[PDB]
Each structure stands twice: as structure tokens, then as C-alpha cells.
Design a protein around this ligand. Structure first.
Ligand SMILES: CC1=C(/C=C/C(C)=C/C=C/C(C)=C/CO)C(C)(C)CCC1
Length: 133
């Protein structure tokens, strides 16, 4: 169902490098970042989300309200401005990031005690799995 609250520790990371390549993240950053285990912290209250994604290298925080379009500045990533919109499709949390890159966004959902994240940009898809701590 729709409750994504918790501290979530990465179990699997697939094609993170291709996704970052599609974002044109620089070589040295990609090569370090592809090594790392991530932790995701999600505070969800009704439609209000506060998320922190953490690694030993760099963190990325984004806050949003479901159904409310917002300007996302991807400073720790590819450093672009996108117009993001997060909505529910069934119990899948879907984000479209409109801007320079085509097909850019992500989908996040819970199955049991695991959180699944699919990150897309261009023709690249990264798939992550996290275990609830
Ligand atoms: C590329 C890249 C990273 C990946 C960040 C990502 C992919 C965060 C996704 C946020 C989402 C989907 C929030 C949903 O609640 C980190 C900062 C780890 C290391 C440096 C470069």
C-alpha cells in the first residue's frame, strides 16, 4: 500500500552507472558513486514527503507534496532545474521530471518490507531495492 515511511538500506543497485551516464554526470563522480551503498530516509505525512538519500560520498534531499508541481534543483546530481510532479498510480509513487532530458523521472513503491526505486532518463533505467531497517 501507500505508506513509504522509514529508514531503508540498499540491498541491490542495478545500472546506476547507465542512469548517471544518461544524466551526464562526470566521470570521476560516476565512478565513485557507482561503488556506494545508499540509505534512504522517508518521512511521509499524508501527502507531504521529506526524503533524504544518503551515501558516504554525497547526500540528496528532496521534499514534496503529492500532486503539487515543484521546481527541483538537482544539485548533488547533474545540477539541473526540472519541473517535478509526484503522483500516485495505484500504490506506485510516480515522478515526472520535465526539463532538458527526455523520459526523466522515477517510480517508487513498497512490496512487503522492501522499497523499490526505478530511476529513468533517456533510454536508461536504474533499478534499486532497499530493505526496511
Ligand atoms: C547520482 C548520485 C546520487 C544518487 C541520488 C539519487 C538517485 C536520489 C533519488 C531521490 C529520490 C528518488 C527520492 C524519492 O523519495 C547520490 C547523491 C547518492 C551520490 C552522488 C550522485
Amino acid at each position: 500500500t501507500r505508506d513509504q515511511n522509514g529508514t531503508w538500506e540498499m540491498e541491490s543497485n542495478e545500472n546506476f552507472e547507465g542512469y548517471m551516464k544518461a544524466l551526464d554526470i562526470d566521470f570521476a563522480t560516476r565512478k565513485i558513486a557507482v561503488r556506494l551503498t545508499q540509505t534512504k530516509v522517508i518521512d511521509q505525512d499524508g501527502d507531504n514527503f521529506k526524503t533524504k538519500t544518503t551515501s558516504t560520498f554525497r547526500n540528496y534531499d528532496v521534499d514534496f507534496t503529492v500532486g503539487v508541481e515543484f521546481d527541483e534543483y538537482t544539485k548533488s546530481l547533474d545540477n539541473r532545474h526540472v519541473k517535478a510532479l509526484v503522483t500516485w498510480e495505484g500504490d506506485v509513487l510516480v515522478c515526472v521530471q520535465k526539463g532538458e532530458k527526455e523520459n526523466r523521472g522515477w517510480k517508487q513503491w513498497i512490496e512487503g518490507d522492501k522499497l523499490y526505486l526505478e530511476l529513468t532518463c533517456g533510454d536508461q533505467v536504474c533499478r534499486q531495492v532497499f530493505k526496511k531497517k
